[PDB]
Amino acid sequence: SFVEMVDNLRGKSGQGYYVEMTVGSPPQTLNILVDTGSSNFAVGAAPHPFLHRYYQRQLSSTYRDLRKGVYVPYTQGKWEGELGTDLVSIPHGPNVTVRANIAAITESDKFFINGSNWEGILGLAYAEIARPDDSLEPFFDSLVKQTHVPNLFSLQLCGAGFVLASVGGSMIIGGIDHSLYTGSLWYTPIRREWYYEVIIVRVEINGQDLKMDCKEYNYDKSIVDSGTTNLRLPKKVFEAAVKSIKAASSTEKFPDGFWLGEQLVCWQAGTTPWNIFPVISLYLMGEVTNQSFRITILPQQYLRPVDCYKFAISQSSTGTVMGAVIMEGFYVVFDRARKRIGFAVSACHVHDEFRTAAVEGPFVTLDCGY
Ligand SMILES: CCc1cc([C@]2(c3cccc(-c4cncnc4)c3)N=C(N)N(C)C2=O)cc(CC)n1
Numbered sequence: 001s002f003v004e005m006v007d008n009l010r011g012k013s014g015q016g017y018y019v020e021m022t023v024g025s026p027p028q029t030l031n032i033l034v035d036t037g038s039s040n041f042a043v044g045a046a047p048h049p050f051l052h053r054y055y056q057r058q059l060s061s062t063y064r065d066l067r068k069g070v071y072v073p074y075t076q077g078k079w080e081g082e083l084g085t086d087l088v089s090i091p092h093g094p095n096v097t098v099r100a101n102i103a104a105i106t107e108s109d110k111f112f113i114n115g116s117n118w119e120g121i122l123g124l125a126y127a128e129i130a131r132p133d134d135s136l137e138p139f140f141d142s143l144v145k146q147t148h149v150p151n152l153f154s155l156q157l158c159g160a161g162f163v164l165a166s167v168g169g170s171m172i173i174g175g176i177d178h179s180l181y182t183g184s185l186w187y188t189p190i191r192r193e194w195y196y197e198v199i200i201v202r203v204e205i206n207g208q209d210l211k212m213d214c215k216e217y218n219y220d221k222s223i224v225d226s227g228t229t230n231l232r233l234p235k236k237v238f239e240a241a242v243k244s245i246k247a248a249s250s251t252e253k254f255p256d257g258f259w260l261g262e263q264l265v266c267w268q269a270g271t272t273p274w275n276i277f278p279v280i281s282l283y284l285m286g287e288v289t290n291q292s293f294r295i296t297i298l299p300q301q302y303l304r305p306v307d308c309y310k311f312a313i314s315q316s317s318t319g320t321v322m323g324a325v326i327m328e329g330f331y332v333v334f335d336r337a338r339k340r341i342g343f344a345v346s347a348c349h350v351h352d353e354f355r356t357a358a359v360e361g362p363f364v365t366l367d368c369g370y
Contacts, residue, residue, distance in 0.1 A: 077109020
């Protein structure tokens with residue numbers, strides 16, 4: 001059923017996962033980054049040094065102007081555009097076509113990426129964080145309202161596994177594909193419908209509790225974001241994490257340029273000492289008040305291939321971000337209809353013959369949110 005949706009994702013390590021889409025009439029083929037960390041469908045629609053193709057409104061008989069501009073600035077650069085609607089389809093997705101909002105980006109700074117091979121972004125989060133405001137209905141809402149596609153989608157991000165390494169995965173829209181995971185799916189509630197916000201109740205390095213007030217883990221928030229490469233942690237949690245990881249791997253020594261995630265380290269062909277780095281367990285709030293469950297990730301996940309790797313755990317000023325390197329261990333279900341997110345061991349996750357990524361619960365925790 002979702003057989004046609006299997007392996008419908010591709011990308012370059014560190015530069016996000018994208019799915020093929022068409023926009024307009026006749027269909028204009030574009031690769032669009034799948035992003036759970038935003039809520040705009042925004043596509044390059046003017047020439048750019050990093051873009052080799054873009055959305056051309058005038059070539060589309062079905063385009064309709066909303067006569068309204070949008071301007072989204074931030075720290076690095078920004079993105080500017082003009083709002084409109086057009087017919088939209090996902091060739092290796094459900095067999096439907098939808099009229100959706102489209103932000104045609106006419107100018108931008110440090111937004112696109114050189115060689116990433118995508119030309120736009122599909123924000124899969126909620127209207128509350130849409131630009132310019134929450135009246136601009138996001139793609140998935142339009143898709144559900146207009147078709148009979150169930151209000152749910154799931155992601156299997158598979159990473160590389162053994163020129164930036166290529167990655168693959170699957171976005172199953174409208175259902176759960178049981179051949180994509182093994183064992184049980186565990187659900188944590190979506191605390192609030194803007195980002196895909198969740199609550200982390202504790203974290204351990206090699207079974208060792210960091211022993212923090214759990215408000216620190218979600219300060220000022222925790223989100224599941226496919227549009228973020230790294231596991232990103234609040235400063236206080238980050239320092240304690242690195243310190244613990246440093247200890248466990250202190251049989252070998254690396255420069256703190258590595259620990260700061262901007263310096264690579266290299267072994268040569270199959271000699272990488274995985275067993276020297278500890279596993280990391282995040283406990284997420286369960287559907288029952290005082291329950292939780294844990295997802296455990298291996299060094300194969302938080303050391304990103306560049307045999308050279310970069311430390312894919314970094315510091316945050318905007319709360320915890322569970323990005324690709326965390327999702328790559330699991331099958332992640334965004335159950336919008338029941339306000340929840342399920343985690344299960346992925347049928348594609350990378351691991352060795354002594355350890356393996358895991359989803360295990362329940363654990364009883366006898367206030368953690370901002
Ligand atoms: C409107 C859509 C949008 C998306 C984003 C981004 C984004 C934008 C462009 C590229 C990436 C990216 C993803 N993987 C790897 N390398 C880069 C992410 N997506 C998320 N989740 N994050 C955290 C973002 O910085 C930022 C903004 C500005 C408010 N706006």
